[PDB]
């Protein structure tokens, strides 16, 4: 059966969310999602350009950035929260819930399959793919095949790191597969290779490092450390 996707709660609003820091080199463009740092002040944003209105970054369209030290005035507390601290509190809790959902075996509605340690040149159907080792996506393209059902859910749950890179590293979606229904969970870090096309919601326990020029469609979560960008186009997957 189709795997049950995690509940994201408040953190569905974020394109990127980290405990410690979100950083970028120049040349990044983030769209359709918010940015958040949960456990450090706004000073832990690096590389971004504050825009006209409080919370805006020039690099960020249809979204705002958030940190718990954001005062009102001039920042704006998201509805319906009474304070920015309360908004960060619910976001922190809901991130933990969703990471834990993806880390727990088995999924409530689907049996676990083996995740290959190299995902290049494979075509995979929906399901839950688990391994305790590290996973690489580099020999070629990973094609995710929704078998004609736009609701098909893909969960990759990984006890080590996840790294895409050269010579391949791209993710292609066919037959109904959608970025919003793909989930990547690493107990280690997630590293996305230079100039690749990546799809899915990344829940890295430690950090997410997106390398030069990669294109992300999905979400980037670092539960305990940081999300770093290097000239990336990041688009939040539609709700
Ligand atoms: Cl684990
Ligand atoms: Cl999508």
DSSP string, the chain: -PPPPPP-GGGGGEEEEESSEEEE-TT-EEESSEEEESSS-GGGEES--B-SSTT-BTTEES--EE-TT--TTTS-PPTT-SSHHHHHHHHHHHHHHHHHHHHSSS-TTS-EEEPPSB-TTEEEESEEEEESS-EEE-SSPEEEE-TT-TT--EEEEESS-EEE-SS---EEEETT--GGGEEEEESS-EEE-TT-EEEEEEEESS-EEE-TT-EEEEEEEESSSEEEESS-EEEEPP-
Cα of 83 from ligand 1 centre, angstroms: 34
Q: State the number of CA atoms in the 13 A half-sphere of 234 facing the CB.
A: 34
Q: Please give the method by which this entry was determined.
A: X-ray
Is the Cβ–Cβ distance between 34 and 11 less than 8 Å? no
Q: Strand 135-137 relative to strand 162-164: parallel, antiparallel, unpaired?
A: parallel
Cα of 54 from ligand 1 centre, angstroms: 39
Closest CA to 11 of 186, 239, 209: 239
Number of compact structural domains in the chain: 1
Starting from the CA of residue 104, give the closest ligand.
1
Residue 172, C-beta contacts closer than 8 angstroms, at least 6 positions apart: 141, 142, 143, 144, 197
> Which residue matches tokens 């290097």?
230
Starting from the CA of residue 158, give the closest ligand.
1
CA distance 220 to 62: 16
Q: Which residues in the chain are followed by a discontinuity, with C-to-N distance exceeding 2.5 angstroms?
A: none
CA distance 30 to 218: 11
Is the Cβ–Cβ distance between 189 and 204 less than 8 Å? yes
CA distance 237 to 35: 14
CA 192 centroid distance within chain: 11
Cα of 173 from ligand 2 centre, angstroms: 10
Cα of 201 from ligand 2 centre, angstroms: 10
Cα of 59 from ligand 1 centre, angstroms: 34
CA distance 46 to 24: 6
Neighbours of ion ligand 2 (CB under 5 A): 178-180, 237
Cα of 100 from ligand 1 centre, angstroms: 10
Q: Which residues pair with 197 in a beta bridge?
A: 215
Is the Cβ–Cβ distance between 169 and 196 less than 8 Å? yes
Which residue range forms the structural domain that includes residue 75? 1-239
CA 205 centroid distance within chain: 11
> Which residue matches tokens 């350009």?
49
Cα of 101 from ligand 1 centre, angstroms: 12
Give burial (CB, 10 Å; 0-12/13-18/19+) of 214: buried
Q: State the number of CA atoms in the 13 A half-sphere of 224 facing the CB.
A: 7
Cα of 238 from ligand 2 centre, angstroms: 5
Direct distance between the N- and C-terminal alpha carbons of the chain, in angstroms, rounded to an integer: 22
């Amino acid at each position: 059966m189709n795997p049950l996707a995690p509940e994201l709660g408040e953190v569905a609003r974020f394109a990127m969310l980290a405990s410690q820091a979100i950083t970028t080199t120049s040349g990044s463009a983030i769209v359709d999602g918010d940015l958040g740092i949960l456990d450090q002040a706004r000073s832990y944003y690096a590389g971004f350009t504050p825009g006209v209105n409080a919370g805006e970054f020039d690099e960020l369209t249809n979204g705002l950035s958030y940190a718990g030290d954001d005062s009102t005035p001039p920042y704006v507390v998201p509805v319906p929260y009474a304070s920015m601290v309360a908004f960060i509190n619910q976001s922190r809790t809901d991130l933990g819930i969703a990471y834990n959902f993806l880390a727990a075996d088995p999924n409530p509605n689907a049996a676990t399959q083996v995740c290959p340690i190299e995902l290049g040149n494979l075509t995979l159907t929906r399901g839950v793919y688990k391994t305790a080792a590290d996973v690489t996506l580099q020999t070629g393209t990973l094609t995710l095949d929704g078998e004609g059902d736009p609701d098909s859910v893909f969960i990759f749950t990984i006890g080590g790191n996840l790294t895409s890179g050269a010579p391949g590293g791209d993710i292609v979606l066919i037959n109904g597969a959608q970025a919003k229904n793909i989930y990547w969970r690493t107990a280690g870090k997630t590293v996305i290779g230079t100039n690749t096309n990546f799809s899915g919601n990344v829940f890295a326990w430690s950090e997410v490092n997106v390398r030069t020029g990669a294109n992300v469609t999905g979400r980037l979560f670092a539960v305990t450390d940081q999300v770093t960008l290097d000239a990336n186009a990041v688009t939040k997957a539609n709700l």
